[PDB]
Each structure stands twice: as structure tokens, then as C-alpha cells.
Enzyme design. Sequence first.
Site, short mmCIF file in Angstrom:
data_model
loop_
_atom_site.label_atom_id
_atom_site.label_comp_id
_atom_site.label_asym_id
_atom_site.label_seq_id
_atom_site.Cartn_x
_atom_site.Cartn_y
_atom_site.Cartn_z
N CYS A 44 55.71 46.54 1.18
CA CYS A 44 55.11 47.75 0.67
C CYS A 44 56.24 48.68 0.31
O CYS A 44 57.05 49.01 1.16
CB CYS A 44 54.23 48.42 1.71
SG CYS A 44 53.57 49.96 1.08
N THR A 72 45.27 53.17 1.72
CA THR A 72 45.80 52.50 2.89
C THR A 72 46.32 53.51 3.95
O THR A 72 46.30 53.24 5.16
CB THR A 72 46.88 51.52 2.47
OG1 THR A 72 47.97 52.25 1.88
CG2 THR A 72 46.35 50.59 1.44
N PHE A 105 52.90 45.72 6.03
CA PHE A 105 53.43 46.14 4.72
C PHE A 105 53.87 44.96 3.87
O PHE A 105 54.77 45.08 3.04
CB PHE A 105 54.60 47.10 4.89
CG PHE A 105 54.21 48.40 5.51
CD1 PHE A 105 53.74 49.44 4.73
CD2 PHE A 105 54.31 48.58 6.88
CE1 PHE A 105 53.39 50.64 5.30
CE2 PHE A 105 53.96 49.78 7.45
CZ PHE A 105 53.50 50.81 6.66
C1 HEM Z 1 51.49 55.72 1.41
C2 HEM Z 1 52.13 55.39 0.29
C3 HEM Z 1 52.04 53.94 -0.20
C4 HEM Z 1 52.41 53.57 -1.43
C5 HEM Z 1 52.97 54.50 -2.55
C6 HEM Z 1 52.18 52.15 -1.51
C7 HEM Z 1 52.43 51.37 -2.61
C8 HEM Z 1 52.58 50.01 -2.61
C9 HEM Z 1 53.18 49.23 -3.67
C10 HEM Z 1 53.78 49.79 -4.98
C11 HEM Z 1 53.14 47.95 -3.29
C12 HEM Z 1 53.68 46.73 -4.08
C13 HEM Z 1 55.18 46.77 -3.84
C14 HEM Z 1 55.83 45.67 -4.61
O1 HEM Z 1 55.11 44.75 -5.09
O2 HEM Z 1 57.09 45.72 -4.72
C15 HEM Z 1 52.50 47.87 -2.00
C16 HEM Z 1 52.27 46.71 -1.29
C17 HEM Z 1 51.65 46.63 -0.07
N1 HEM Z 1 51.25 47.73 0.70
FE1 HEM Z 1 51.51 49.69 0.16
N2 HEM Z 1 51.69 51.70 -0.30
C18 HEM Z 1 51.58 52.79 0.55
C19 HEM Z 1 51.10 52.75 1.86
C20 HEM Z 1 50.71 51.63 2.58
C21 HEM Z 1 50.25 51.54 3.98
C22 HEM Z 1 50.05 52.63 5.08
C23 HEM Z 1 50.01 50.26 4.21
C24 HEM Z 1 49.51 49.72 5.56
C25 HEM Z 1 49.05 48.46 5.68
C26 HEM Z 1 50.30 49.49 3.02
C27 HEM Z 1 50.17 48.13 2.88
C28 HEM Z 1 50.69 47.32 1.90
C29 HEM Z 1 50.69 45.87 1.94
C30 HEM Z 1 50.15 44.93 3.03
C31 HEM Z 1 51.31 45.40 0.63
C32 HEM Z 1 51.54 43.92 0.28
C33 HEM Z 1 51.26 43.51 -1.15
C34 HEM Z 1 51.66 42.06 -1.24
O3 HEM Z 1 52.84 41.77 -0.91
O4 HEM Z 1 50.82 41.18 -1.62
N3 HEM Z 1 50.72 50.36 2.04
N4 HEM Z 1 52.18 49.15 -1.60
#
Ligand code: HEM
Length: 452
Positions: free
Chosen positions: A392, A260, A385
Site C-alpha cells: 500500500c 480503508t 498493506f
Molecule cells: C490512507 C491512505 C491510503 C492510500 C492513499 C492508499 C492507496 C493505495 C494505493 C495507491 C495502492 C496501490 C499501490 C501500488 O499498487 O503501488 C494501495 C494498495 C493497497 N492498500 Fe492502500 N491506501 C491507503 C490506506 C490503506 C489502509 C489503512 C489499508 C489497510 C488495510 C490499505 C490496504 C491496502 C492493501 C491491502 C493494498 C494491496 C493492493 C494489492 O497489492 O493488490 N490501504 N493502496
Amino acid sequence: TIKEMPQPKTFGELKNLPLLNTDKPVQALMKIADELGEIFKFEAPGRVTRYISSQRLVKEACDESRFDKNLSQARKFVRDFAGDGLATSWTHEKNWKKARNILLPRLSQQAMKGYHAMMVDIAVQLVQKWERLNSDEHIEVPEDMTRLTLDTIGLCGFNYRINSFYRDQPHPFITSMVRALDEVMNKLQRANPDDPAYDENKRQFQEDIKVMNDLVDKIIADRKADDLLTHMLHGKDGEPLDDENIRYQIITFLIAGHETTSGLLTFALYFLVKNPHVLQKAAEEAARVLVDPVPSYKQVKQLKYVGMVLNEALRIWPTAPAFSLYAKEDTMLGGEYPLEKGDELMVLIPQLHRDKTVWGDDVEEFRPERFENPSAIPQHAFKPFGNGQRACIGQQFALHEATLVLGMMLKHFDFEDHTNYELDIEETLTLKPKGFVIKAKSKKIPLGGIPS
Ligand code: HEM
């Protein structure tokens, strides 16, 4: 004043599923929701989902008293290789909220003061590879954006050096990850799953989940022989993490924590070469701000306009493009569309970021100055996010990494959009520009206290 819910052309036992026989499903679900409105139903055999695109309805869906979090139908498969463990568990899970309150404090703004140095280490690597291209040579953007974002998670998160830049050909793990997702994605457009027609395919997939596991073996081995894995091993709550679920959490962050983020940088740089006045304007901010060869934590926090260019490019193109939700009780939504308990809504993010009632009519223009007063963006009109108690987790890691890097790029180079690149967005669950290439004229500014 109840209103019947819309629905694309069904084709038989298939229902609407054959509208997704394309390799750009999201991009097509926003042509559908582009005609059928703020919401529309979607049936494929034994699974139904509603698709919300307006801020009017999303702001209700995010009301955590009505709705809980859900597994994309894509997520239950990417669970056939990830959680139990953060990005593919339900809020009603034990190795969720325990698995999250071990890592949450390692990912705050304050925690970035610590990763910052290793983030700058991988960034220097990318800048200098560009300093050393011949004349004729162009840049493969998404390709090199992955080299970075992956190296950077591997290193900050797991204090392991993947050395992605010391390799002409995309790291094994990435070639296999890509080919593992394209499957999950097509096994979703497949009308009869358990079939022998798809047979060389679920054995391919296994070979790929091995290559990916290789690198995970290699990262634990290196630890034995204050990183994010130093807790994922010895962090209590009050239970540390167990035998089996930890090699999950690992492949989980090697993927979530770069893909992402590689998306977001390819997109931003695309938008900038196409809007050379925004490039000019962030290129100045960067020159004016980063006055040491390398940037300080302090300096990266003052790339204000560059933070803005990132958010804008995240509005126009969320790289994790949709998140799912279920109803916690029977309920009206919008006051028109009546949902049972457990019914499923999907937040089509790229469309929500195009809701003109919340943004303007210039929702399709790249304008970073929207985010000048971020108190001006309304309740819920912007969510790249996710939302709520499942936002996120790696957002502050992502944004620091991405600002730092976009910031340096703009300090040491001018870029030319030499091919007049016409945008083509490859979909592997997450979005990323495909075959995006540019040339870079170096500003011949030394870096590291090293000349070129
Ligand atoms: C760069 C380091 C990143 C890590 C380590 C990471 C990790 C994660 C994790 C662990 C979750 C689930 C969190 C939870 O359920 O409590 C998540 C959810 C999500 N992340 Fe990331 N992420 C990163 C970057 C990004 C970026 C740049 C975006 C840009 C769109 C993104 C978009 C999302 C979205 C839309 C979810 C929603 C999941 C949901 O609620 O159904 N992430 N991410």
C-alpha cells in the site's frame, strides 16, 4: 508427494459461485477456508482462483521471483472506473511505475511532517462535533469516521475542502461510491452478466460515476482558481501525467485514501469499547503524551501503544481484505499444489492473521502488546498493506492520520458501548462495521485554546 487441491460444493453450471450469493462474501470465504484448510480452489464460470490462508504459503506467494501482482476479479471492474493508475494497473504497465514514482516520495514518513497540520485541522473538526452532541445523542462511528478520512485526503492530497462535517447527510460522493461498489461486488456474484434483468443497474452505476466525477471537476477547478495534485500535474520521472489518466488517479485516491482508513478506525474503536482495559491504557498514553491542545508531528510519533492498537485491529480485521497474484512460471507451491504459469492465488488476509502456527491460539483476542517487539511478528504473517513492490503506497499517510485521531479521541473522551453493540461487518469490497454506535462522555479538556 503431490496433493490434490480442495474445493467447496459445486452446483452445476455455476460451479462454486452460488456460495457467494451472500452480501458478506469474504466473511464466508473464511468459513470455507476455515474448513478446507490453508488452500482451496474456487471456480466460477471461466475464472479460477486459489485461496491461500497460511503464512507457510503466503511467504512463498510474496516471493516476487515466482509471483507478480494481479487484478482481483473485483479489480477489473473497479478498473472500469479507476486505473490505468496505481491501485488497478499490473506491474507490466507504463502509467503504473511512472505514475508511482511521481507520488511515492510525496507519501514517505518525512512527507507527513507537511500534511500533519491539515490532518490536525480535520481532526479538531471531528472531536468538537462530539463535544457538541446533546445528552440523548449518540455517535454514528463508521459514519463519522468517513466524514474525517475523506475530508483529510481531499485536503492533504488535493488541497480542497470537502467540508464533510458541515453536512448532516453523508456527502453525495460517498452515497454514490458505496452504491457503485455494491454493484461491482454483485456483478461478481451474477451468473449471467450481460443480462436485461440487471438493466436499471448499469445505468444507475453510470449516474453514480457522475456524482463522483462532479467532485473531481470541483477539485481541479479549485486548483486553477505542494499538494499531492501539484505533482499528479507537474511531476516528471521522464514524463508528467497526461490528459485522461489524471482524472483517474484523482477518483483513485479519493477512494483508496479514505475508505480503508475509515474502516481501520471504526474497527479499532469497536475493539476498545469491548476491551475497556486497552482503552484505559491508550487513554493514559494519550493523556501523558499530548500536552499541547493540538498534537505536534513529534507527539504523534510517540503514541506507541496507540500505533499498536491500530496494528492489532488491522490484524484481526484487514479493511482491504485480499490481494491477488499470478504465477510467473510453472511451479510447485508448498511442494504439493502444482501451478501452471498464470494461475491465480488470492491472499485471504483476515485468515492469514489467524494462522495459529504463527500467532498463538489466542488469535481471536484483542491484544495490542503483540506489537511490542515488532521484530517478533514473523516473515509475512502480517500484511494489511499488501506485499512487495506493490505494498500500500498510502500506508504511512494512513497510520499517521489514524494514530493522531485515535490519539485525540482518547484524550478528550471516555466512550460507553451503550447498546452492547453486536458486531456486524458490511462488505463493499472493503470491510467496515455497520451501524456501530456509542456514547461519549467528554473529559472536558480544552482544545485549540477553545473551551468545551
Ligand atoms: C490512507 C491512505 C491510503 C492510500 C492513499 C492508499 C492507496 C493505495 C494505493 C495507491 C495502492 C496501490 C499501490 C501500488 O499498487 O503501488 C494501495 C494498495 C493497497 N492498500 Fe492502500 N491506501 C491507503 C490506506 C490503506 C489502509 C489503512 C489499508 C489497510 C488495510 C490499505 C490496504 C491496502 C492493501 C491491502 C493494498 C494491496 C493492493 C494489492 O497489492 O493488490 N490501504 N493502496
